[PDB]
Amino acid sequence: GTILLDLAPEDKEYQSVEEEMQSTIREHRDGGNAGGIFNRYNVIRIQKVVNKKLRERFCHRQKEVSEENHNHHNERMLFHGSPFINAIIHKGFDERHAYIGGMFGAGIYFAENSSKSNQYVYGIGGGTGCPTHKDRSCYICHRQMLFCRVTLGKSFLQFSTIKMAHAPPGHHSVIGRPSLAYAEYVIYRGEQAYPEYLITYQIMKPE
Numbered sequence: 539g540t541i542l543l544d545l546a547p548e549d550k551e552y553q554s555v556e557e558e559m560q561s562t563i564r565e566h567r568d569g570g571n572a573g574g575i576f577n578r579y580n581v582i583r584i585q586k587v588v589n590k591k592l593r594e595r596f597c598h599r600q601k602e603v604s605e606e607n608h609n610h611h612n613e614r615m616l617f618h619g620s621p622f623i624n625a626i627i628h629k630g631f632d633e634r635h636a637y638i639g640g641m642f643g644a645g646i647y648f649a650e651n652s653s654k655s656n657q658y659v660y661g662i663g664g665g666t667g668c669p670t671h672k673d674r675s676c677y678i679c680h681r682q683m684l685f686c687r688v689t690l691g692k693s694f695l696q697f698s699t700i701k702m703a704h705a706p707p708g709h710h711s712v713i714g715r716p717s718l719a720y721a722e723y724v725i726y727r728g729e730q731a732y733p734e735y736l737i738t739y740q741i742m743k744p745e
């Protein structure tokens with residue numbers, strides 16, 4: 539099955555991830571409502587995720603995309619936030635659990651910003667917050683999110699909202715961009731993301 543490797547805070551890889559996570563915070567048009575109000579994360583733990591059968595599926599699908607797109611699979615590290623991280627680290631992302639209702643349809647949703655994904659950790663628009671306090675802005679309950687390798691191949695740039703079941707013909711990903719507040723990345727096959735890093739953390743209260 540799946541194996542989680544603890545990264546030590548002195549591991550360069552640990553700081554690499556934290557750095558990405560911390561710096562990619564932005565303030566939102568919420569009032570920080572859904573993800574909660576903060577400027578910084580307390581990172582409790584970071585584990586690297588290792589799963590043979592998942593990696594084999596990811597690697598092969600890259601090949602495919604690489605042929606379809608002039609030998610460049612265009613892999614980017616992006617954050618994912620949702621309630622189903624636990625499923626995801628043993629099984630992998632799975633488009634069968636993605637439905638048409640989403641902002642861009644039956645895709646799996648990522649972000650270049652940590653703080654974007656943190657809005658989705660307890661559901662769409664924060665659902666009813668953390669299990670235990672019903673608080674979108676719990677500064678105590680441990681949150682989880684993922685820092686993934688995503689195979690984008692050839693992205694179809696999108697500006698308004700459109701609902702679609704699959705990637706558009708000739709493309710391998712959608713990107714929804716500004717004029718929308720921050721960048722969103724959407725794939726429509728689970729094998730085009732590998733959950734490389736599991737981050738456990740809390741959001742800190744400003745003074």
Ligand SMILES: COc1cc2ncnc(N3CCC(CN4Cc5ccccc5NC4=O)CC3)c2cc1OC
Nearest residue numbers: 620622625630631632635636645646647658661662
């Ligand atoms: C136990 O059930 C699940 C197992 C899953 N195993 C793997 N991948 C899953 N997903 C792939 C598709 C994803 C689409 N979404 C839905 C969503 C809802 C609320 C907030 C954020 C998101 N982000 C997504 O990417 C949701 C997670 C899974 C989703 C599951 O429940 C829906």
Ligand SMILES: [Zn+2]
Nearest residue numbers: 668671676679
């Ligand atoms: Zn809580």
